[PDB]
Design a protein around this ligand. Structure first.
Ligand SMILES: CCCCCCCCCCCCCCCCCC(=O)OC[C@H](CO[C@@H]1O[C@H](CO)[C@H](O)[C@H](O)[C@H]1O)OC(=O)CCCCCCCCCCCCCCCCC
Ligand SMILES: CC(C)CCC[C@@H](C)[C@H]1CC[C@H]2[C@@H]3CC=C4C[C@@H](OC(=O)CCC(=O)O)CC[C@]4(C)[C@H]3CC[C@]12C
Lengths: 42, 390
């Protein structure tokens, strides 16, 4: 059996979120370097 | 100030006794150095390319002359010729370093900021110094001038109380720190103690002292010295061996550090200049005007050092360019006359700095020789031991 998932609200959000995250890598840890350059007297 | 209201006779006998020319009277409290920036004519702040290129080219010419000579006669010359070429190269580089100090405070060529940043970095690297860290330490010095327990980026004196504490911890005057202080502030090596300053930069090579938003800028600052000491100090050695190192790099380096140390030490230290703690009477304007000593040199030396001795003017008008420092002083000497102190670089001054003014005691608020002070506080150690009878 299956519990009739498509008319629900927790499952719709978790479904959309899991699919979007599984599409492509989304972690951007190297873009934060701009946060170490806000003070430069050049 | 230490010598308060008293006639001109005792002032002048103190003056010629210590080697100063004009001692200072007493400045009112509750002021700020930035006040007297209104006493300056507005034409003093103007930019001109003539003095700029002259200031960047004269010391370069002196350096090139010294190097051409030294290489023309590499190692066939006796030691005195080597000493003289080293002295010339050291002085030329002290001039270029004054230019770099100007670019660090953003007052050499403000129209092109990228160019002046690059120039300051380049001229500071050969002394193995960092430009951003230098800016920071100098600003911290200007904010805390003569403040006891806080002016760590200047010639903080060795006080009597901390010496007594170290002697109580050492259990005698024979420990390691004892002999270290003994030779560092009793022998002429004091005129090189600026090298200690050099090691206290690189604040442990520790990025945890700074504000995070500046990491990339600080790191870059440390990479210009290192690159030098990683790409150029090899070449020199590889092309001249130990001797070709000690005569081409180490001797000019020691001369430059002589200049740095003597300039600063004479600038902010004298028997009539007190070091008040914070909350206990420390005043900003009083310490920046009355607590400064101006050294006078021969005009050839001055033009070689880019007027590096004139420090008082650029503490009241921090944007005042380098070539307007002599003239500006003449202005202030007219209005702040009775309060300023002045001296001429002579042998007597340095002998007094080495042999007489060694320990600072705050009760008498003056400088006293190290040996008499330590034997006095040791006799009081014996007397408190007698007081420790029961
Ligand atoms: C050139 C002109 C440039 C224009 C710029 C001028 C700006 C002037 C600012 C410069 C400030 C210089 C300060 C000098 C200073 O801090 O030094 C003066 C400081 C003394 O200062 C005190 O020193 C104490 C010692 O711990 C504490 O650190 C105090 O905090 C510190 O204030 O020198 C020392 O650190 C002395 C101890 C180090 C021992 C010296 C090593 C000797 C090695 C021998 C070298 C070979 C000799 C052959
Ligand atoms: C070797 C010659 C030919 C080139 C010049 C080398 C310098 C770039 C090196 C050698 C001495 C080094 C310094 C020696 C001592 C220290 C302290 C050290 O940190 C500590 O000791 C932290 C405090 C502690 O350990 O308790 C590391 C940084 C620093 C300034 C070093 C920074 C890099 C320096 C200046």
């Amino acid at each position: 059996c299956l519990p009739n998932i498509h008319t629900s609200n927790i499952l719709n959000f978790t479904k959309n979120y899991e699919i979007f995250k599984s599409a492509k890598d989304t972690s951007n840890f190297g873009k934060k370097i701009i946060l170490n350059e806000m003070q430069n007297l050049t | 100030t230490s010598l308060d209201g008293l006639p001109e006779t005792q002032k002048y006998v103190y003056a010629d006794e210590w080697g100063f020319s004009r001692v200072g009277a007493d400045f009112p409290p509750g002021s700020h150095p930035s006040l007297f920036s209104q006493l300056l004519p507005q034409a003093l702040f103007a930019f001109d390319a003539r003095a700029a290129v002259a200031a960047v080219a004269v010391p370069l010419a002196a350096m090139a002359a010294g190097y051409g000579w030294l290489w023309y006669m590499h190692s066939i010359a006796p030691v005195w010729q080597q000493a003289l070429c080293a002295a010339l190269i050291g002085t030329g580089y002290a001039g270029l370093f004054k230019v770099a100090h100007e670019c660090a405070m953003m007052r050499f060529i403000p129209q092109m900021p990228g160019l002046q940043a690059a120039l300051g970095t380049l001229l500071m690297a050969p002394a193995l110094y960092s430009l951003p860290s230098w800016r920071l330490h100098h600003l911290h010095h200007l904010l805390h001038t003569n403040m006891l327990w806080q002016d760590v980026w200047g010639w903080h004196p060795l006080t009597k109380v901390e010496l007594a504490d170290e002697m109580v911890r050492s259990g005698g005057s024979g420990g390691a720190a004892m002999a270290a202080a003994r030779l560092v502030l009793t022998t002429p090596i004091k005129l090189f103690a600026s090298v200690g300053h050099w090691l206290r930069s690189w604040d442990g090579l520790d990025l945890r002292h700074f504000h995070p938003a500046s990491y990339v800028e600080v790191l870059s600052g440390w990479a210009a010295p290192l690159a030098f000491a990683g790409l150029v100090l090899p070449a020199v050695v590889s092309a001249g061996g130990l001797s070709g190192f000690v005569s081409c790099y180490l001797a000019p380096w020691l001369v430059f550090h002589f200049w740095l140390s003597v300039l600063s030490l004479t600038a902010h230290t004298a028997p009539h200049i007190p070091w008040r703690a914070e909350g206990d009477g420390w005043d900003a304007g009083r310490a920046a005007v009355a607590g400064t000593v101006t050294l006078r040199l021969p005009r050839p030396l001055e033009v070689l050092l880019n007027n590096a001795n004139y420090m008082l003017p650029q503490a009241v008008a921090p944007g005042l360019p380098m070539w307007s420092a002599p003239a500006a002083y003449a202005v202030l000497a007219a209005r702040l006359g009775p309060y300023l102190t002045e001296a001429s670089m002579s042998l007597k001054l340095l002998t007094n700095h080495v042999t007489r003014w060694q320990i600072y005691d705050e009760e008498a608020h003056t400088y006293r020789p190290m040996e008499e002070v330590v034997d006095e506080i040791e006799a009081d150690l014996q007397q408190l031991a007698a007081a420790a009878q029961q």
